[PDB]
Amino acid sequence: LDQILRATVEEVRAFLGTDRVKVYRFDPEGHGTVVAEARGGERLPSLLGLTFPAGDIPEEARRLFRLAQVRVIVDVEAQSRSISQPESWGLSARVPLGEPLQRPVDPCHVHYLKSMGVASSLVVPLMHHQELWGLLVSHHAEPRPYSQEELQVVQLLADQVSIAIAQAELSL
Ligand SMILES: *[C@@H](C)[C@H]1/C(=C/c2[nH]c(/C=C3N=C(/C=C4/NC(=O)C(CC)=C4C)C(C)=C\3CCC(=O)O)c(CCC(=O)O)c2C)NC(=O)[C@@H]1C
Incomplete structure (x- = not known):
């Protein structure tokens, strides 16, 4: 599991x-x-x-990866901001996207990326069945939008990986 995953990040x-x-x-x-x-x-x-x-990882956001498998961070320069509300969301994620072609992230996580020299990162989760096992993430120091085609193939790769961690688990 530790060895396979190391090889997976090299080709990715x-x-x-x-x-x-x-x-x-x-x-x-x-x-x-x-x-x-x-x-x-x-x-x-x-x-x-x-x-x-x-x-570092609340909950409402983690559910979305488990429910919709879709999240990305936009150009820290574009100044896209996210905010919470007097109320908290949870199962509400049951809804499919329903938001502009972009996803804003609160300023907290945003600067953290700036502090990391990162401006735009794509997020893809690793999950098996109804369970979320991990989180994949790519870092781009400069603006670099993602293509609808490349996004899936990877989402699939992740899914293919999420499957590997599942299949490999039985071994242990
Ligand atoms: C700021 C930290 C406050 C906060 C808001 C917030 N952050 C997230 C979720 C993420 N945080 C990520 C962190 C990283 N980068 C790493 O190097 C690493 C360890 C290996 C991770 C996982 C990050 C990129 C995410 C997304 C992945 C996830 O599922 O959490 C979010 C959710 C995004 C959204 O807009 O819904 C926000 C807004 N969380 C707090 O409690 C802090 C006060």
């Missing part, structure tokens, strides 16, 4: 030629670890083996 980056792409796995307690990472000329630092507090 090559296909997108993105500066950095890493695979992230979700643990039952909310914590996750970086088990796969590729660097575009050591441009970005290696976060391999580092743990990211679960508190």
Whole structure:
């Protein structure tokens, strides 16, 4: 599982030629670890083996990956902003998209990317059946919109990967 996933990130980056792409796995307690990472000329630092507090991932957003498998972050420069409301959303995700061709992310996560030298990142999750196992993410330091065609093939690759983690799991 740890070996396969490492190989998966190597070919993936090559296909997108993105500066950095890493695979992230979700643990039952909310914590996750970086088990796969590729660097575009050591441009970005290696976060391999580092743990990211679960508190970093709320809940409403995580459900959307499990329910709709669709989320991307736009040009931090375009200044697209997201905000919460007196009320909280949950199962409401049962709705398919229903938003402009773009998705805004609150300013908190936005600068975090800026602080990381990232301006636009594509997000694709890894899931099996009704369960979400991890989160894939590509980092683009400069504006780079995604194509509807390439997006699926990858979404499929992720799905193909999500399937691998499932099939490999039985082994252990
Ligand atoms: C800011 C951190 C506040 C917040 C808002 C917020 N952030 C997200 C969700 C994400 N955070 C990501 C983090 C990264 N980058 C990594 O390197 C890494 C560890 C390997 C991850 C997973 C990130 C790109 C996401 C999306 C993935 C996910 O499913 O969470 C969101 C959701 C997006 C949306 O607009 O719905 C927002 C708005 N969360 C807080 O509690 C902070 C106060």
